[PDB]
Structures are given as C-alpha cells and as structure tokens.
Ligand SMILES: CC(C)(COP(=O)(O)OP(=O)(O)OC[C@H]1O[C@@H](n2cnc3c(N)ncnc32)[C@H](O)[C@@H]1OP(=O)(O)O)[C@@H](O)C(=O)NCCC(=O)NCCS
C-alpha cells in the first residue's frame with residue numbers, strides 16, 4: 001500500500017473508519033449507487049462496513065481521492081480478488097464535471113501498469129453508464145468484449161462492457177470466431193434461429209440458400225455463426241455451441257419454445273452462476289443458451 | 294423525401310446540381326476528406342457526379358444543411374443499401390465548431406428512428422476520428438462493436454468503430470458464441486493454439502484436461518472456444534471455424550507456421566476483402582484465419 005499524487009489530487013490508501021465519513025457522500029447517494037453492484041449504503045456506519053470488506057479483498061488496492069481544496073470527491077482503485085486487474089471508481093454527484101475521476105482513475109491505471117507491475121487493467125462498466133464509459137475512454141480503456149451480469153438487488157440482469165488497457169497491446173489479435181454449422185436446410189435453419197434466437201441473416205448465398213450467416217445481433221459486427229448446406233443422404237454429427245446471452249433465462253427460453261424450437265429446458269440453474277437450456281437443431285447441433293439468470 | 298427543421302438549421306433533400314457548388318467546399322477539401330471513404334473531389338463537377346451517385350443509392354436519404362446565416366456548412370444523412378441503417382455527415386473546415394454536425398446528425402437520427410420507421414441507425418467512425426466520434430457520442434450513439442476496414446486509396450487497413458442507437462430495445466441478445474471442438478488431446482491442443490493462435494488457457498477441468506477453454510484474447514471476455522476430449526475413431530465431421538483477425542495475414546501466417554501448426558499454405562486474397570490461410574487441426578477441424586490484408 002503506497003501513495004499516489006497527481007497534477008491536482010493525492011490518492012491515499014483507503015481507511016474504512018477514517019474515510020467512511022466522506023465516502024458515504026457517494027455510497028449513500030441513490031443517484032450515484034444507481035450503478036453499483038449493490039444498493040446505496042444506509043448509514044456511514046454501513047458504508048464503513050462495506051469499505052472494510054472491499055479492502056479485505058485479496059490484492060485490492062483502493063485509494064481515497066483527496067481534491068485540491070481540502071475535500072474528498074470519492075474513491076478510486078483496483079478491485080482485489082481478481083486474477084486480472086479490475087478498476088473501480090465513483091464520486092459524489094458534485095465532484096462530477098471536474099475531471100477528477102478521469103485524473104484519479106488515470107492515476108490508478110498509470111500506476112498499475114508500471115510500478116504496480118501489472119500487464120494490463122480492466123474496467124467492467126454497464127452499457128448505460130455513459131458518464132463512466134466516458135471516464136474509461138479518456139483513461140485509454142477500450143472495449144475488449146461484453147458479458148451479461150445480474151445484481152441480486154436488481155430486478156433483472158444487465159450488459160457489462162469489458163474495457164481494458166495493456167502496458168503494450170498485442171500487434172495481432174482475433175476479433176471474433178464465426179463457426180460453421182453443416183445444416184440440411186439452410187433456408188429453414190435461418191427461419192428457425194431468426195425466431196428462436198432472434199438472429200437475423202447477415203447474408204444468404206443461393207436460392208434456396210446454400211450458405212448464410214446468422215447475426216445473433218442487430219449490429220453490423222458481433223456474435224454470429226454461418227450455415228453450410230450439406231448432402232448425404234446422411235445427416236451429420238452434432239456441433240455444440242455455447243451462447244452467453246443477455247436477459248433472463250426463461251424470457252429467452254420462452255422465446256425458443258414459441259419459435260417452435262426443440263428445447264431441452266426449462267432453464268436449469270448451474271453452480272457456475274448462470275441459468276441455461278439447450279436448443280437442439282434437427283441436424284443434432286446443440287446450442288446451449290446461458291444467461292446470468 | 295421530406296424536410297428537416299431544427300433549432301437553427303434547415304435540412305433539405307440533397308440536390309446534386311444545386312448543392313454541388315457549396316458542398317464541394319468539403320468534398321474538395323483534403324483536410325475534410327482525410328477520414329472519408331474516397332479521396333477529395335477534384336472539381337465541383339466531380340463532387341456533383343459523386344453526389345448524384347450517393348443519392349442514387351438504395352435508401353440514401355441525404356439532406357443539405359442550411360445554417361441560420363444563409364450559409365451551407367455541410368451535408369448530413371442516411372446512407373443507402375447498408376442493410377443496417379447507416380449515418381453520414383461532414384462539414385467544410387470553416388463550418389467546424391458550431392455544433393452543426395451534432396444538431397443536424399441528431400436531426401437525421403431523431404427522424405430516422407421515428408417517422409422514418411427505422412429500428413436503429415449505425416455510424417462507422419474510424420478510431421482516430423475523435424471529432425466525429427465526439428458528434429456521434431453527442432447524438433446518443435454508443436459503441437456496439439469494432440471491425441477492421443481498408444480503403445483502396447489508403448496504404449493500409451484501419452480500425453472502424455461501429456456506434457449505434459436503437460429506437461427499439463432488444464432486451465435479449467447473444468453476447469458471445471463459444472464453439473466446442475471435440476479434440477482427441479485437449480492438453481496438447483491447448484499447447485498448439487497457445488503458440489499458433491496466441492490463445493491463453495482459462496479452463497482445465499480434469500487431469501489430464503478433458504475440457505478446457507482457449508481464450509484467443511488476453512481479456513476476460515472475448516473470442517475463445519472450448520476443447521472437449523473425444524476418443525474412438527472420431528471425430529468424423531471436422532469443425533469449421535472462421536477467425537476474423539487484426540494485423541497482416543502473412544504476419545499471422547508466420548506465427549502459425551513457426552508454431553508448427555499445419556497450414557494449407559501462404560495467405561491467399563479472397564474476393565470479399567480479406568486475405569486468409571487455414572490451419573488444420575490434427576483431428577481435422579479447420580481454422581481459417583482471415584485478416585483485412
Ligand atoms: C463515473 C462518475 C464518478 C462520474 O465521473 P466524473 O468525475 O463526473 O466525470 P469526470 O468529471 O471524470 O469527466 C470530466 C468532465 O469535466 C471536464 N474536465 C475538466 N477537467 C478535466 C480534466 N482534467 N480531465 C478530463 N476532463 C476534465 C470534461 O469536459 C469532462 O466532460 P464533461 O465536462 O462534459 O462532464 C459517476 O457517474 C458515478 O459515480 N458512477 C457510479 C460508479 C460506476 O458506475 N462505475 C462504473 C463501474 S466501475
């Protein structure tokens with residue numbers, strides 16, 4: 001545990017009992033916590049309770065931001081318990097619009113990549129937290145992927161954006177993997193997935209189509225797989241695909257069912273945290289739909 | 294084709310012959326066309342030729358922006374064909390800094406998602422185009438993905454940022470597809486990809502590995518695939534995976550070769566704009582590595 005000083009601020013190792021007082025200014029704020037992993041803190045005493053817990057986290061370097069005018073805008077640091085550098089930050093609704101979070105985060109990052117001896121850092125930010133993704137982008141964190149999450153106090157799951165910055169980026173990197181499913185009737189498989197997985201055909205070659213691409217998203221680039229028509233008169237040999245989704249399991253499940261897809265659900269909860277059900281294509285392929293809940 | 298009216302500007306359906314004169318102020322400007330798809334127009338006549346072509350495009354709904362000062366700062370509108378609604382905009386250098394592009398783009402978008410009857414719009418902006426990424430951010434467009442592109446007049450490829458706004462709200466969507474490769478020797482397959490594709494391990498259930506996950510990226514969430522141990526005279530049907538990569542094809546080619554992987558030979562340029570080579574796994578699975586060049 002060390003100290004960090006920037007061109008304005010001075011980050012100091014968080015002290016639950018000492019900082020719980022100023023920090024509650026953010027943790028007890030609903031508009032600021034309307035973005036955290038749990039609901040806002042009730043009392044500075046509970047905030048204290050929380051704080052001490054976070055520091056406990058193995059390898060959790062957290063600092064209390066101390067602003068240029070004897071004030072404490074908030075917290076910024078690295079989540080411990082991670083097997084790959086996590087970034088955390090939040091300010092009181094007022095310290096907003098000063099570039100504190102950006103400067104404090106950039107500070108923690110800068111430190112982390114060098115003297116901290118990390119090969120890179122990550123920041124998981126919800127899709128709607130524009131103010132946060134803003135901080136992250138300024139700091140040099142770019143989108144590396146995405147994953148669905150679910151906070152217990154939350155009525156439903158949500159989409160997290162995984163942004164990261166490396167000491168030095170890899171010159172080469174695979175942007176995506178598009179797997180091919182040898183299907184008996186492409187034209188039909190497309191109609192199926194378009195309703196069972198809400199996919200859309202990225203493109204269809206042939207009439208009827210003998211090769212196509214199903215975009216599991218409504219956006220140009222993103223998760224998808226291709227469909228290659230096959231002969232026989234044999235069938236094939238099942239391919240297995242795991243689809244990590246966003247949204248409730250049963251919501252998705254209900255989608256699969258309705259579309260008339262052959263399902264091996266309802267959603268069954270699994271010890272690794274997600275709930276799932278398996279769609280089985282006429283040809284035998286098995287698309288496991290996994291969701292946070 | 295209708296009219297757009299804003300809290301300052303008035304967007305009017307583009308008129309190649311009428312507006313080509315003013316708009317050439319941008320298309321003829323090299324500093325303004327630096328991020329464009331094509332090089333600047335030599336003459337207001339070429340710009341007119343260019344402009345009519347643009348309008349000809351399928352669903353190309355373009356408007357000439359008219360500023361509250363009897364001036365024409367630039368153009369803004371929706372590109373045609375795209376499939377996934379597209380966004381365009383550019384201003385003459387002298388018209389920069391007045392919030393014109395933001396207002397006019399936010400106009401075209403606001404319109405496009407309602408009375409236009411579109412379910413969403415997308416804007417592909419190069420990573421470097423900070424000034425445009427700024428407008429996009431302001432209009433409410435968020436990063437949905439990224440892809441590598443390559444303009445002819447460009448000496449090389451470049452990163453494209455796909456931002457977007459959905460009038461809709463598809464709650465369910467796939468965040469990733471992780472395919473399973475029935476491999477005879479998991480422990481070793483990991484070694485291979487490890488060096489040939491630069492994969493990283495993450496899973497390793499069983500001793501020795503009977504199921505694993507090869508993260509083709511250093512980042513928590515991202516492209517990857519699973520390895521499932523399979524005995525008997527199988528598999529009989531090899532899996533086909535298409536990996537869209539970043540970097541030059543040969544560069545990647547060398548890696549796979551060096552790694553000692555079995556490649557079908559040097560990178561061949563394909564009609565769809567990528568150069569690729571295939572790695573063939575001992576069990577028959579075919580990994581096609583595709584790069585923009
Ligand atoms: C993230 C959060 C703290 C806000 O960050 P923020 O401090 O208000 O954003 P910054 O103040 O860091 O951004 C600086 C802004 O001020 C200006 N600014 C002034 N000085 C600046 C400087 N030195 N550097 C950068 N920007 C500066 C910029 O123009 C910038 O954009 P804006 O003016 O339009 O707001 C707040 O949304 C929050 O509490 N979120 C909950 C926590 C969370 O969800 N985290 C994500 C998961 S870890």
Ligand SMILES: CC(C)(COP(=O)(O)OP(=O)(O)OC[C@H]1O[C@@H](n2cnc3c(N)ncnc32)[C@H](O)[C@@H]1OP(=O)(O)O)[C@@H](O)C(=O)NCCC(=O)NCCS
Nearest residue numbers: 325328381382383384388389390391392393394395424425
């Ligand atoms: C089209 C584009 C990017 C224009 O950028 P711009 O001129 O900065 O966009 P605006 O006109 O909305 O600029 C807004 C600026 O004016 C300011 N402004 C001044 N008066 C304003 C007013 N009354 N209302 C709103 N904003 C105002 C804003 O605060 C903002 O400050 P900033 O320059 O630091 O961002 C332009 O730079 C361009 O032609 N680029 C080349 C083509 C291209 O980038 N294409 C992208 C692929 S689609």
